[PDB]
C-alpha cells in the first residue's frame, strides 16, 4: 500500500499528483481539506417533514402569522409588508429548498451526519457565551444583515484561487457541500429565533467561520500518498476475522482486502444483489 503511494503529494495547485506529475485527484479528497480539521456535523435541511422544514426555515413578511415577531428583531414592527425584503426571504427559502433536493440526491438514505470542516454548532455556542446573549431582548440585525452577510461569507471560503472559469467553477464545487450546511445553519428564521444573535455576535460568527474554514484546507507538501496507505494499512493490522464463526456469508476483512488489492479474478465469494 505504502510503496504504491509514496510519491503522491498535494501540490501548490491544490491538485493530487505523483512522481510523473500525473493527476490522481483534482483537489485532495474531492474537497481540498486536511483530514485533521474535520468533524461529523448534521445537515438539518435534509431530514424531517416538509411541514417541519417550513416551520423551521420560512419567513413571510407578507402574512400576519408567518413574519418574525418584533420580539425577535428591532425592525419587526416596520418589517411587515416590505415587498422588497420579502424578495430576499423568497429567494433565500427558494435556495434552502434547492439545498434539500440536492442533499437528498447525494445522501439518498437521508443520512444527515457527515464529517465537514467547520464545527458551526460550537461557533454559535461560543458566541452565546462570548457575548452573554439574552434570549429575551430583540436583535439589532436587519433582514439584509443576515441574508446578504451569509451570501458574502460564501465568497471568502476559498480552497482554489484562480482567475479563470475552470478553476473558479472548481472552487464552486469544492465548497458545494459545506455551503449547504452554512445556508442551513445560518437561515434568517434560525439566526433570529434559535440563536438569538446580535449584529456583533453574528459578524463574529461569520469571521470565525471564514478564518476557521481557511485553516481547514490541505497544506501543499502534504504527503497524502503515505498518509492514505498507512491509514488503510494500520486498521488492517487491528483486524480479527475471517467472518465470525457461524443473510449471505461473504469472505471479509484481511482475506477479502488481499482479494481486492490483488484485483483477483477468481474471488472466493462472488455474488449479485438484484433489486
Amino acid at each position: 500500500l505504502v510503496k504504491a503511494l509514496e510519491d503522491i503529494m498535494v501540490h501548490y495547485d491544490n491538485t493530487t499528483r505523483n512522481s510523473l506529475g500525473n493527476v490522481i485527484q483534482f483537489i485532495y479528497g474531492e474537497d481540498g481539506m486536511d483530514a485533521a480539521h474535520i468533524e461529523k456535523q448534521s445537515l438539518d435541511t435534509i431530514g424531517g417533514s416538509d411541514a417541519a422544514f417550513e416551520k423551521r426555515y420560512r419567513v413571510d413578511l407578507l402574512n400576519t402569522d408567518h413574519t418574525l415577531d418584533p420580539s425577535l428583531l428591532e425592525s419587526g414592527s416596520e418589517i411587515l409588508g416590505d415587498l422588497k425584503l420579502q424578495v430576499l426571504l423568497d429567494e433565500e427559502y427558494k435556495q434552502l429548498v434547492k439545498d434539500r433536493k440536492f442533499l437528498r440526491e447525494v445522501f439518498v438514505d437521508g443520512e444527515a451526519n457527515w464529517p465537514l470542516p467547520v464545527n458551526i454548532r460550537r461557533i454559535i455556542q461560543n458566541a452565546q457565551q462570548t457575548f452573554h446573549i439574552d434570549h429575551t431582548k430583540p436583535s439589532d440585525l436587519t433582514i439584509k444583515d443576515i441574508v446578504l452577510g451569509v451570501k458574502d461569507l460564501q465568497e471568502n471560503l476559498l480552497v482554489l484561487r484562480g482567475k479563470n472559469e475552470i478553476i473558479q467553477n472548481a472552487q464552486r464545487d469544492a465548497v458545494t457541500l459545506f455551503c449547504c450546511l452554512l445556508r442551513s445553519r445560518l437561515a434568517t428564521r434560525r439566526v433570529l429565533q434559535e440563536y438569538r444573535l446580535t449584529k456583533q455576535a453574528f459578524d463574529w460568527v461569520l469571521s470565525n467561520i471564514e478564518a476557521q474554514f481557511l485553516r481547514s484546507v490541505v497544506h501543499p507538501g502534504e504527503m497524502v500518498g503515505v498518509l492514505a496507505a498507512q491509514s488503510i494499512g494500520e486498521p488492517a493490522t487491528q483486524m480479527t476475522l475471517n467472518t465470525f464463526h457461524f443473510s449471505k456469508k461473504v469472505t471479509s476483512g484481511v482475506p477479502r482486502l488481499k482479494e481486492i488489492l490483488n484485483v483477483a479474478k477468481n474471488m472466493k465469494t462472488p455474488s449479485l444483489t438484484v433489486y
Partner: peptide, 13 residues
C-alpha cells in the same frame, strides 16, 4: 471490523 477511515484515504487508493 467496525473501524472508521476518513473517505479520502480509501478514495485515494
Amino acid at each position: 471490523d467496525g473501524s472508521y477511515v476518513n473517505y479520502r484515504h480509501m478514495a485515494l487508493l
